[PDB]
Amino acid sequence: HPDISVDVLVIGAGPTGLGAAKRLNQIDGPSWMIVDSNETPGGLASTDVTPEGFLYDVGGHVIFSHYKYFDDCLDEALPKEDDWYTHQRISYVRCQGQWVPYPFANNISMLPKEEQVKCIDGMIDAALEARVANTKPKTFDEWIVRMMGTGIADLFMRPYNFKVWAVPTTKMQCAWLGERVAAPNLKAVTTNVILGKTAGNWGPNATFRFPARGGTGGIWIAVANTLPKEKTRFGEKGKVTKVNANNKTVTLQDGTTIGYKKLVSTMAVDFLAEAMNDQELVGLTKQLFYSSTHVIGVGVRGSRPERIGDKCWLYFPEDNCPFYRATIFSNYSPYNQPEASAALPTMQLADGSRPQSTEAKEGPYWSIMLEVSESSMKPVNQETILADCIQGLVNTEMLKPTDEIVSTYHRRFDHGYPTPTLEREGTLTQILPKLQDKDIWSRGRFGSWRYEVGNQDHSFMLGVEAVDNIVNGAVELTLNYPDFVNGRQNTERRLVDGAQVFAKS
Amino acid sequence: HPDISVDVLVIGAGPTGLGAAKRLNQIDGPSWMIVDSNETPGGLASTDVTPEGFLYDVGGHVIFSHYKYFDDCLDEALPKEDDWYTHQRISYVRCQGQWVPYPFANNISMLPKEEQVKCIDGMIDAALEARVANTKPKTFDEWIVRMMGTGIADLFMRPYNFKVWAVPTTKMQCAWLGERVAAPNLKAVTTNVILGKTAGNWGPNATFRFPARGGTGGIWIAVANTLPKEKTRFGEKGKVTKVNANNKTVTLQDGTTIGYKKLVSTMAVDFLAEAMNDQELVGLTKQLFYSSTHVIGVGVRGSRPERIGDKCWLYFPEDNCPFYRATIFSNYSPYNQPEASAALPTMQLADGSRPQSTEAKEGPYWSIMLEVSESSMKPVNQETILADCIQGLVNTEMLKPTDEIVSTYHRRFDHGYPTPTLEREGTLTQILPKLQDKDIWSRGRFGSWRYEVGNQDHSFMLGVEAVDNIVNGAVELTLNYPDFVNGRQNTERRLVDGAQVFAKS
Amino acid sequence: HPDISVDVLVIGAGPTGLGAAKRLNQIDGPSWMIVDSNETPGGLASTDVTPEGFLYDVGGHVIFSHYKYFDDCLDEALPKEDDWYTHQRISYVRCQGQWVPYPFANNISMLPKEEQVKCIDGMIDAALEARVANTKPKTFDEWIVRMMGTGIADLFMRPYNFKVWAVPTTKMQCAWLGERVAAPNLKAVTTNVILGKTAGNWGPNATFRFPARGGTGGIWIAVANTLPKEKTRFGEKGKVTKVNANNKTVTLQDGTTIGYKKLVSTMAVDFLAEAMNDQELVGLTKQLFYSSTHVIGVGVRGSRPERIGDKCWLYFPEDNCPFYRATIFSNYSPYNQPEASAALPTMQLADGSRPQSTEAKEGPYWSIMLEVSESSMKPVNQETILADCIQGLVNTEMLKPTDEIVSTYHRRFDHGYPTPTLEREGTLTQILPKLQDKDIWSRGRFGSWRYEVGNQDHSFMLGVEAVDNIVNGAVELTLNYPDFVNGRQNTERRLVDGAQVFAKS
Amino acid sequence: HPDISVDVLVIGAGPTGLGAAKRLNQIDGPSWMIVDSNETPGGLASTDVTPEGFLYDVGGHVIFSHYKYFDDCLDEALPKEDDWYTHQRISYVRCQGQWVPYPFANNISMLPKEEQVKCIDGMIDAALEARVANTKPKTFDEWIVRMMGTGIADLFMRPYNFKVWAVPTTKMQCAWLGERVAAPNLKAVTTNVILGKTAGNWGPNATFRFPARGGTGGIWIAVANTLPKEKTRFGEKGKVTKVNANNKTVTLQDGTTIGYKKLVSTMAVDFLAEAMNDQELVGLTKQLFYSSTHVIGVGVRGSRPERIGDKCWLYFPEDNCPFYRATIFSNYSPYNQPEASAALPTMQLADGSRPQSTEAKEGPYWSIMLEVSESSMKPVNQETILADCIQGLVNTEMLKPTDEIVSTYHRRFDHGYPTPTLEREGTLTQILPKLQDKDIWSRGRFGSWRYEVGNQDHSFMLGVEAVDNIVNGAVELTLNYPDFVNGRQNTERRLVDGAQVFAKS
């Protein structure tokens, strides 16, 4: 007999596992338990802080919720209006010395005219081909060239996506992008070119809310806090080391055994296979591809520069910086960095030189968060990546040579992106049913490895829906039909359903 | 203070209401109750029997299930292997003196060569048009022509569908036929023409199962019998006459009042509007279109004729008979008609003449079940329809003039088919949200009026999913996404879910 | 026995008949004669002069030669370099206050942006349709919209061609336009819009030459002067009044009868039918359509205005002037108007007011030649057309209200344009073969009535080729294959052929 | 000074040269003469006879005339009705044991149903592709597949045309096939398949006439006979050995020199280049490609077999015989072979055995003429090709094993077909204008190397039009515009033109 026995055991207290926990807690039927090797819940949706007081998420984390259930749990966790800041979804593409509003294609009127001609000629070809197309694109690259034409593809989506995915666009599928036809919006693009118009896809109704304190990680700490503490096991005491799928027994690092009837596992599925000592699953999960993410944080002295303004996140297709995305993390909340009265010495100037003075000086401070991808196909010199990022900031005119850097952060996350390679689905439909047949629901960004449902809300709901499938025979919609959940407002499932209402009466 | 109070009240014990009841009974959380104006459950899936012992469904009722849940409940209701007979899905189109195997298009080698040429030429036109098509068809009629071409459209699907829907194909939408592209399989069609090949779309795996006894109606009687009787109220005592949406009160014919928190209504939504005395909903619901169904049954003396053979249901595009569909109901179960030793007098010959002898003679017997549609655009003379059907049987060579008719059946069903008119969705999306706002789940073939999810399994699941939405926050997938539920085997929801397993333990 | 007998009789000494004459003269085989009712050869390629000394062709006459033979004869007629002036083919479309360089489509960057959007959008539509097109346009109008898209068509070619042809574009055929596919050069148009480029289709390559003296009419006088005088009969003495096709006799005004073996007739073919007293032909030729041409000439005092500059001819689609084309005729030759030292009183100012002084003042002078079309679908008020034209000049900002007019000219030419109606070919293919069966080669702008081979060089060559057909069995390429002769350099036929080289030896 | 001086010298007296000579003779202006290395005129349109009295053309020669002028000269040469036999243009394709009426595609109902399916499927693909095609086919092979689809291409035109051209279809251009769009008549082909219909493209109005005597060669003997003998020089005395283009002097084998002003050379242009000792031209003409033609003739004892019947020529795609075409030459004239009373011993049986006796037996006789192509890409074993051909005749069931062969014939013609390779036009534009600039009109099947204008009428008219260009400035339409002359009836040029009519007065 194992030390602990529960009906449903949840491994991992990132958004997915917490989703499973929250749903189990709401249903209040089967016994359950959640474990995490980290004392602090949140996983990749956690937040670090430098010794100088600058917070950094694991790269740009902007919430767009497809589900009311997710909203319910965030509202429960952080119920006060001052728990959040609301911002417009402002993003630009750095291109040829300019900040081009996203979407790129609608804003190429900013480029030299001769280049616009190349862009529009390419999109005309694509439109004419789209007109007689009777096949779907088979690769991410084909998809891009059909949508954008060669010229526009080459300027942004092709080089940008290699910098993101750390694999060539030709090596990825495109089903993950959705069911919409791969055909250019020629009229809209040439209209903006003709009008000399620029326009971002944001405004008063295109917004996101961000936690006032604790970064994105503050949400998941707060969400976790609503769970009965005794049913949680976070820290070294909750690190899973072995999974015995045949005995339905999990062994933790401290030797604790937990027997389960159903397992919801949210650790990366390649790690799950290893913990299972299942050589066949190890082989299969090794066929999956993923990139690592280097997060670089730079804390800068000064009031926010006008050139930066209300920018939130920023895309970098070009070669003059190693990062694919930058986030103005100080715009997300005033508590993402020290108050102006905080005294901090300058560590370096953005041009890499030593500061004139060693002396601690006051703020205000602002803050840049950078992401750099790495894979077997795109190595990263870890030793120079911080300095390369900082030079990248200078090259892109995000920082002046003289800007004073008062804090730096760098951390590598080995499992950063699950790659939608051409081979992903062929592999996953071998892995996930095999685990399913052992009553293991492997779910989450790396639990089930599908980037198109890999955000915080998707993840959360993958855990929720796994539990719902386990308990109430629900369809795992997020898992198996990304286009479905992403194409609608999911309003049916609530933190308080009829069940809880009828039971209280 | 009403006579009865329940959490969830179900109006109607056709498949939809029984689905609601079955799921409610399984969940065994919220209190619930089901009423029906008929002492016998089954609604349009019920079965009549003539004084001579010939059973008739409400027209051809053949089950194809999209749900394991539905399968679970039928297996529970009728668990013996001899509770069912299995048949291949054998259907034919009557056309120019011939029984043409379905699908029609794949079998036009049976038509005159000159006609084949016209058919193939039309389909060539359609194939070439489809190659450069960039719009969806907007009407049922466009859909048909784009799929078949003019020649083939005119032979079968155009005139057939008028005889079914009692409206022109040009007045119906085509979204209900699903997401499949309106394109011809020119190759398949020409290939069978060239080979002089015929091929039906059935075989050892294209089957259905039919109840051994009591016709289709026997399923729903058996299913209802699994419910706690004290929670059922069937007969004049169960007839709803008033629904007060604002007080959440239902009044029955005998004066009994029922209080509900949530209402699952499976009566025709235009009747619900009337029962609610809601003038706005009344106005909106009579904007919905429907046809009535005349079911005509003909019991015939003799062993099954060779010309009939294993035929199950039959399509009649031509105007030499009033019915659109015929079912060889005696093929579905030997118990749909009297045993061979039973003595019955001959009522008339198929050509309308009197029999030579009035004496009762033995069988064996076979049975034809016919459907005639009626609408404001297609009146039916109730006084002559039986005679006209029987003449139609002779005209189509199903009966010889000499065949001995020993039983007739005719019944008009007011609400037969909810019509997928162009205006249906515009109307429904005004009606269902208003009912929803009042905590009324109006669901079913006429509860929610969508033919494409109008079969017994859909209906059953509409009830089930409505309950699941009310209780567990489930998406009503059958209701809102016909294409989704019809394009998969829905396997997640079972008659025994995890919740009941964990509860028993 | 007729007064004169010749092998080949040529009626008419416009370019066509002179073509026939020149070729007959060169061949110097069969006997021949040429007659004209006019003492001055040239037909519609003649030139008038006003009492003030301003020359006007019959509307804008610009030579583009497709034939070496035509060049040979022109070189023989006017051999000196100073017999000619060379100019670039400079033309503009007057549109919304702007002189838009021809071709119109390539210069819409001069229009308001919002209009460029509509134009480009329409041409995108046309481009996308053209990609899947599998039929030829049936009408001029369809041809235009397929080439240009709606927006661009509506701006220039649609309203312009109605003002030219005096019939709707929907009533004309489009074969006459040539074999080029009716498809938009979207890329060229969008490219120039993006670049803000304006470009006319002219330069040092694209030139025409114009006679130094006597206007276009000076050419044909000089060509006619190369003919043996005694074989010509020009004036009232040469006016044909009757053709007896059955007797092969022509009767002149003065009573002179001419017998011929073959007749090359270049008068309008409807007049020919009348002269033949052939009622069948009269019937047929009355079914042909043609517009009349009003030529309005305006002599203006002053050096050439800067706004006019090197402009040659000008198109006017818009409704603020009655003319469809204007020619800066003073740009074609300094001898088209009096020298600067010539003194002329001011007749009126352009706004219609009287001049302050009635005295003769010196120049220099420039000159505008306008064309207004007339037909039964488009009446012209002869009494007001001059004044309306002059108002048009002000409206289009060709003339300032203050500009001094020193000469006016108006003349109506009954047969101006042979109209490429939908019906034209059906009618002509009935007329010409009947004339052919009587050894009558009816040829020329109204001899054979085909605009697409209706210029001076085509006309000349129609006569040349008729004679070559008559004598040498040559194919009448210009007559029957406009596309052929217009799509190539016709260099084989020379004014000195091998036959004359070998003969002289 | 040369021995002879003429205005125009014509080299070669096949149809091309004779054409030039006829037109020169008719014009009767410039002095001229015509030479040939052969005593008998006719070139590749000549006829041989075996010692046993069997005539053979140089392979199948069937006249289809596009020109009245050619008709006039043939009528002049052979004016009597009994100088000619008229036959319907009856041809078949040998395929899978069947004689399939030409055109093949319209007659594939003769093939097995499974072949029909493959054919129609392939043509459906071609039809769908042609619906969106917007490029011309670049090669002969692309043209075939686009017209026919794969199945049909593979059965006839692909393998047949390799057997003809002795180069792969992928190595040839397709412009020579004319300007008709490369698209299938799917409807017509499937219609005949559906109906089980066969139909040859012949009838009472699809005929050819063949000379009663002397085979095709009889025509050109007769045409040449109409020329003044003293202007001809045929035989060793007329063999050109040297052409000095700079001196305009030609040297014959016997030392005779002929000065000319214009040269019409109809010898193969590569031969001309050698005769000119012009290394540049030799190099260019060596880039041209041509195939050699082996003509095999077989004389057979017996009345014409029923299986043969009225067949005229026959196509052989299949690899069970070396020849690409057979001609039932005995059907063309009864004087192509000996009369029935002629006694001839049997030389061999068709199975290859040498017969019993040397007894000369009587007829009647029939006759087969075969063509086998050869090139550097397709060698022919000259020593065995006769025997291989005869075996082919047995394999294709043209001869029974026991059929008695009484005459054999085999001759290799070095220049047989001028190949429309991809490179042909590029090379000819470097050759023919260079010759032109030296006043050399190189014309004819190998004079100008264009197969699409390479028949007897084309060749004749290339000569005629060359003279007409030389003397009268005519367009060389057949040379430069094969589509033009082949798409019309050329009626204008006659053996008696107006010039001669007028002159005789």
DSSP track, C27-86: H--S-EEEEESSSS--GGG-EEE-TTS-EEESS-------BHHHHHHHHHHS-SGGGEEE
**Facing residue for C124 by CB, picked from A113, A186, A193:** A186
**Facing residue for A190 by CB, picked from C120, C195, C196:** C120
C-alpha B319/C-alpha B159 separation (Å) is: 9
Enumerate chain D positions whose Cβ falls within 8 A of a Cβ in B. Answer: 113-114, 116-117, 120-121, 124, 127-128, 131-132, 186-187, 190-191, 193-196
Which chain A positions have a beta carbon within 8 Å of B481's beta carbon?
Answer: 484
- Spell out the long-range contacts of D246-254 with Cβ–Cβ below 8 A and sequence spacing 24 or more: D246/D438, D248/D439, D249/D2, D250/D9, D250/D11, D250/D35, D252/D35, D253/D37
Give B334's DSSP letter. Answer: G
- Enumerate residues 6+ apart whose C-beta is below 8 A from C180: none
Nearest CA-CA distance, residue B147 and chain A, Å: 16
Our CA angle for D217, D219, D222, nearest 5°, is: 110
Which amino acid is residue C392, in one-letter code? G
Secondary structure element (H or E) that encloses residue D395, with its range: helix D385-395
Bridge-based pairing of strands D313-315 and D325-327 is antiparallel
Best of C111, C191, C192, C193 to substitute, by most chain A Cβ atoms within 10 angstroms, is C191
SS3 annotation, D107-149 = HHHHCCHHHHHHHHHHHHHHHHHHHHCCCCCCCHHHHHHHHHC
Which chain A positions have a beta carbon within 8 Å of B31's beta carbon?
Answer: 502
Angle between helices D68-77 and D15-27 (to 10 degrees): 90
Secondary structure element (H or E) that encloses residue C299, with its range: strand C290-301
CA atoms within 13 A on the CB side of B206: 9
What three-state secondary structure class fits B169?
A: helix
C-alpha B430: how far from its chain's center?
25
- Enumerate residues 6+ apart whose C-beta is below 8 A from A452: A176, A177, A178, A420, A482, A486
Radius of gyration of chain A (CA): 24
C-alpha B285/C-alpha B267 separation (Å) is: 13
Put simply, the answer to whether A113 touches C195 (Cβ < 8 Å) is: yes
- Token readout for A20 is 């499973």
C-alpha A101/C-alpha A110 separation (Å) is: 9
Put simply, the answer to whether B493 touches A503 (Cβ < 8 Å) is: no
Q: What are phi and psi of D15, to 5 degrees?
A: -50, -40
C-alpha C59/C-alpha C61 separation (Å) is: 6
B409 touches B54 (CB < 8 A): yes
C-alpha D432/C-alpha B378 separation (Å) is: 79
- Token readout for A139 is 């690769």
Q: What are phi and psi of C149, to 5 degrees?
A: 80, 165
C-alpha B312/C-alpha B330 separation (Å) is: 9
Nearest Cα to Cα of residue C35 among C223, C215, C263, C282:
C263
**CA torsion angle A173 A177 A182 A184 (round to 10):** -130
Count how many residues are written for chain B: 505
- Token readout for C486 is 């217009």
Whether residue D30 has a cis bond before it, omega within 30° of 0: no
Radius of gyration of chain C (CA): 24
C-alpha C469: how far from its chain's center?
25
Enumerate chain C positions whose Cβ falls within 8 A of a Cβ in A. Answer: 113-114, 116-117, 120-121, 124, 127-128, 131-132, 186-187, 190-191, 193-196
C-alpha A428/C-alpha A453 separation (Å) is: 14
Nearest CA-CA distance, residue D124 and chain B, Å: 7
Nearest CA-CA distance, residue A120 and chain C, Å: 8
Burial class for C246, CB neighbours closer than 10 Å (0-12, 13-18, 19+)? exposed
Q: What are phi and psi of D352, to 5 degrees?
A: 100, -10
C-alpha B60/C-alpha B267 separation (Å) is: 21
The listed CATH number (3.40.50.2300, 3.50.50.60, 3.40.630.30, 2.30.42.10) that belongs to domain B7-505 = 3.50.50.60
Count how many residues are written for chain A: 505
**Facing residue for C121 by CB, picked from A124, A131, A187:** A187
Put simply, the answer to whether A196 touches C113 (Cβ < 8 Å) is: yes
A303 touches A47 (CB < 8 A): no
Which amino acid is residue B437, in one-letter code? D
Structural resolution in Å: 2.2
- Token readout for B245 is 């949406």
Nearest CA-CA distance, residue D25 and chain C, Å: 14
C-alpha D370/C-alpha D375 separation (Å) is: 17
- Enumerate residues 6+ apart whose C-beta is below 8 A from C120: A190, A191, A194, C151, C189, C190, C193
What three-state secondary structure class fits D505?
A: coil
Count Cβ atoms below 10 Å from residue B145 Cβ, excluding itself: 24
How far is the first Cα of chain C from the last one, in angstroms, to the nearest whole number? Answer: 39
Residue with tokens 């080391």: A241
- Enumerate residues 6+ apart whose C-beta is below 8 A from A109: A116, A192, A193, A195, A196, A197, A198
C-alpha A347/C-alpha C263 separation (Å) is: 105
Best of C72, C475, C501 to substitute, by most chain D Cβ atoms within 10 angstroms, is C475
Residue with tokens 């395929």: D95
B231 touches B32 (CB < 8 A): yes
Widest distance between CA atoms in chain D: 75
B288 touches B418 (CB < 8 A): yes
C-alpha B335: how far from its chain's center?
21
Count Cβ atoms below 10 Å from residue D75 Cβ, excluding itself: 14
Which amino acid is residue C456, in one-letter code? Q
Put simply, the answer to whether C473 touches D132 (Cβ < 8 Å) is: no
- Token readout for A267 is 């650790």
Which chain B positions have a beta carbon within 8 Å of A132's beta carbon?
Answer: 132
Which amino acid is residue C38, in one-letter code? N
C-alpha B343: how far from its chain's center?
33
Strand segments, DSSP code E, in B419-486 are 440-442
Best of A109, A117, A134, A150 to substitute, by most chain C Cβ atoms within 10 angstroms, is A117
Residue with tokens 């001839």: D344
- Enumerate residues 6+ apart whose C-beta is below 8 A from C445: C14, C16, C43, C44, C418, C451, C454, C459
Nearest CA-CA distance, residue C200 and chain A, Å: 20
Give A12's DSSP letter. Answer: -
Give A118's DSSP letter. Answer: H
Bridge-based pairing of strands C404-418 and C440-442 is unpaired
Nearest Cα to Cα of residue D487 among D144, D180, D172, D73:
D180
Our CA angle for B463, B467, B469, nearest 5°, is: 115
C-alpha C149/C-alpha C119 separation (Å) is: 7
Enumerate chain B positions whose Cβ falls within 8 A of a Cβ in D. Answer: 113, 116-117, 120-121, 124, 127-128, 131-132, 186-187, 190-191, 193-196
C268-297 burial, b at 16+ Cβ within 10 Å, e below that, comes to bbbbbbbbbebeebeebbeebbbbbbbbbb
Write down the number of H helices and E strands in chain D. 16, 21
C-alpha B484/C-alpha A481 separation (Å) is: 10
B475 touches B84 (CB < 8 A): no
Q: Where are the domains of chain B?
A: 7-505
Query: DSSP for C304-351?
Result: PPTTTTT--EEE--STT-S-SEEEEGGGT-GGGS--TT--B---EETT
Nearest Cα to Cα of residue A190 among C155, C125, C103, C105:
C125
Q: How far is CA C357 from CA C344, C351, D257, in A?
A: 11, 16, 86
Which chain B positions have a beta carbon within 8 Å of D191's beta carbon?
Answer: 117, 120-121
B452 touches B9 (CB < 8 A): no
Burial class for B476, CB neighbours closer than 10 Å (0-12, 13-18, 19+)? buried
**CA torsion angle D147 D150 D152 D156 (round to 10):** 90
What three-state secondary structure class fits B84?
A: strand
In chain D, whose CA is at the least distance from the CA of C469?
Answer: D492
Nearest CA-CA distance, residue D205 and chain C, Å: 25
Radius of gyration of chain B (CA): 24
Helices (H), A9-139: 15-27, 68-77, 113-132
A485 touches A66 (CB < 8 A): yes
C-alpha B261/C-alpha B258 separation (Å) is: 10
Give A377's DSSP letter. Answer: T
A414-450 burial, b at 16+ Cβ within 10 Å, e below that, comes to ebbbbbbbbebeebbeebbebbeeeebbbbbbbbbbb
Experimental method: X-ray
Query: DSSP for A422-433?
Result: TTHHHHHHHHHH
Bridge-based pairing of strands D257-265 and D4-11 is parallel
Query: DSSP for D326-372?
Result: EE-GGGT-GGGS--TT--EE--EETTSPPPS---EE---EEEEEEEE
What three-state secondary structure class fits B473?
A: coil
Our CA angle for A300, A305, A308, nearest 5°, is: 100
C-alpha A443/C-alpha A272 separation (Å) is: 11
Put simply, the answer to whether B191 touches D113 (Cβ < 8 Å) is: no
Enumerate chain A positions whose Cβ falls within 8 A of a Cβ in C. Answer: 113-114, 116-117, 120-121, 124, 127-128, 131-132, 186-187, 190-191, 193-196
C-alpha D17/C-alpha D463 separation (Å) is: 6
D323 touches D389 (CB < 8 A): yes
Q: How far is CA A357 from CA A360, A408, C125, C502, in A?
A: 8, 18, 65, 105
Nearest Cα to Cα of residue B249 among B72, B85, B438, B431:
B438
Q: How far is CA B47 from CA B43, B88, B335, B462, D268, in A?
A: 9, 22, 12, 22, 93
Secondary structure element (H or E) that encloses residue C22, with its range: helix C15-27
Strand segments, DSSP code E, in C331-484 are 348-349, 365-374, 404-418, 440-442
Residue with tokens 């020119």: B186
Secondary structure element (H or E) that encloses residue A478, with its range: helix A477-480
Best of D502, D504, D505 to substitute, by most chain C Cβ atoms within 10 angstroms, is D502
**Facing residue for C29 by CB, picked from D131, D492, D502:** D502
Nearest Cα to Cα of residue D322 among D183, D181, D450, D162:
D162
B20 touches B467 (CB < 8 A): yes
C-alpha C170/C-alpha A451 separation (Å) is: 56
- Token readout for C417 is 């344009």
C-alpha D322/C-alpha D380 separation (Å) is: 9
- Enumerate residues 6+ apart whose C-beta is below 8 A from D33: D4, D6, D9, D10, D231, D232, D233, D258
D228 touches D25 (CB < 8 A): yes
Which chain B positions have a beta carbon within 8 Å of A498's beta carbon?
Answer: 30, 262, 470-473
Put simply, the answer to whether A121 touches C187 (Cβ < 8 Å) is: yes
Give C479's DSSP letter. Answer: H
In chain B, whose CA is at the least distance from the CA of A500?
Answer: B471
Our CA angle for C424, C429, C430, nearest 5°, is: 105
Radius of gyration of chain D (CA): 24
CA atoms within 13 A on the CB side of C419: 31
C-alpha D200/C-alpha D106 separation (Å) is: 8
How far is the first Cα of chain B from the last one, in angstroms, to the nearest whole number? Answer: 39
C-alpha A313: how far from its chain's center?
13
Q: What are phi and psi of A5, to 5 degrees?
A: -130, 125
Strand segments, DSSP code E, in A37-83 are 47-49, 55-57
Query: Which chains does chain D touch, 3 or more C-beta pairs < 8 A?
Result: B, C
Q: How far is CA A101 from CA A153, B102, D424, in A?
A: 16, 57, 55
C461 touches C67 (CB < 8 A): yes
Give B399's DSSP letter. Answer: S
Count Cβ atoms below 10 Å from residue A362 Cβ, excluding itself: 13
C-alpha C142/C-alpha C149 separation (Å) is: 10
Best of B262, B436, B464, B492 to substitute, by most chain A Cβ atoms within 10 angstroms, is B492
Residue with tokens 């939405």: B469
Nearest Cα to Cα of residue D396 among D120, D100, D189:
D100
Secondary structure element (H or E) that encloses residue D315, with its range: strand D313-315
Bridge-based pairing of strands D4-11 and D32-36 is parallel
How far is the first Cα of chain D from the last one, in angstroms, to the nearest whole number? Answer: 38
